[PDB]
Symmetry: D2
Subunit: 46 residues, 4 copies
């Protein structure tokens, strides 16, 4: 279920933390918003 | 609103996934972010 | 190989994604023996 | 320094590993190639 990742460099660490945060948080978003968002993307890039 | 370009399909798909997570995150109310961030303080240094 | 674009909402988001595109694209200027050696270690 | 983070979800962990790999490898690129690449972006 849970994984451990090691990184060298503070700047790299902080960067990965921001992405870890966004990735973990989006699981608290109701699926129809997620799906709505992906529908929208289809007009925004190929 | 800003535009970036990237070489490589795999690279493109990776950036779309992160873009999604970064953009969706703003639809998460602030109290759930706080409750999430407080929790992280127990999970890594 | 091919070239794709994307749109991003937010300057913070764009700056984050730019750093990541950079590393993703720069990585291919890395000699393959150095890629293989790094992967050798990481695995252990 | 070395740092660790915990992450929930195998796919989340998988995306993050590739970005970890790319950020570390990229430190190997000689600086002139990095500067050249940046200006080319502009």
């Amino acid at each position: 279920d849970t994984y451990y990742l090691q990184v060298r460099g503070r700047e790299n660490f902080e960067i990965l933390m921001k992405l870890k945060e966004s990735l973990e948080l989006m699981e608290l978003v109701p699926q129809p918003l997620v799906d709505s968002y992906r529908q929208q993307q289809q007009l925004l890039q190929r």
